[PDB]
């Protein structure tokens, strides 16, 4: 595996601080990062130019991983939705790629957000997972203003082995997640 600043920071500075702060008895009992699933809810490309390959290209550039499609589980009248119609994207990032993307997200992305005042503290799962949203894709460094055609945000779900929101917030803020409160 690759040598990364964020993974090394975890194993070096975040592990012992956590063990001290909570008093874990086992090495595995400590909270670890499990996965980070990114999902462009899209749905704007139902009809119109359903060719959403620009958005999937953007995701493949930001994550270094080609996303997959998501389709409708049912047809919906008001949403102009036919069952089985491609309406979104979802890429599951784990391990080294997860660390890479989280590094670039914490060091570049979250700063470049318009009127950024921190991440919402109450956005925790209750089981020890966190979620957030993004209004644009220009936030990430791999996306410039020329190669973009339309603004399209995304959803980020970070899944942690922690059991309470307390341990999860500890791990995430220690890793460098900026919380507004």
């Amino acid at each position: 595996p690759l040598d990364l600043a964020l993974k090394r920071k975890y194993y070096e500075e975040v592990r012992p601080e956590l063990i001290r702060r909570f008093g874990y008895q086992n090495v595995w009992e400590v909270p670890r990062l499990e996965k980070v699933v990114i999902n462009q809810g899209l749905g704007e490309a139902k009809e119109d130019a359903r060719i959403l390959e620009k958005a999937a290209q953007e995701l493949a550039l930001i994550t270094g991983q080609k996303p997959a499609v998501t389709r409708a589980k049912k047809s919906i009248s008001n949403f102009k939705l036919r069952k089985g119609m491609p309406i979104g994207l979802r890429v599951t990032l784990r391990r080294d790629r997860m660390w890479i993307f989280l590094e670039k997200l914490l060091n570049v992305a979250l700063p470049r957000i318009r009127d950024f005042r921190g991440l919402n503290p109450n956005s925790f799962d209750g089981r020890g997972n966190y979620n957030l949203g993004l209004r644009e894709q220009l936030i990430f460094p791999e996306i410039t203003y020329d190669m973009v055609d339309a603004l399209r945000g995304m959803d980020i779900a970070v899944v942690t082995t922690a059991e309470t929101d307390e341990e999860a917030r500890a791990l995430l803020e220690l890793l460098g997640f900026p919380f507004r409160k």
Partner: protein
């Protein structure tokens, strides 16, 4: 992974405007950014760019204390 469908990750230099350099991995080996976490106002303590005013209203008038008493 599936070969031929993923943009290759390579060692990447992410340069910030404040002079911060970040050693990472990405699809573009060099990327310059306008701001980073080491110089954003919310990060670096409380570097309130222009407005660290103090409101300053309303009692901050005090022009002046010349009315008789």
């Amino acid at each position: 992974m599936k070969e031929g469908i993923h943009p290759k990750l390579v060692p990447a230099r992410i340069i910030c405007g404040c002079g911060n350099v970040i050693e990472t991995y990405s699809t573009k080996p060099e990327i310059y950014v306008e701001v980073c976490s080491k110089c954003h106002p919310f990060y670096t303590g409380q570097q309130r760019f222009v407005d660290t005013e103090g409101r300053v209203e309303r009692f901050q008038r005090r022009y002046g204390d010349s009315y008789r008493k």
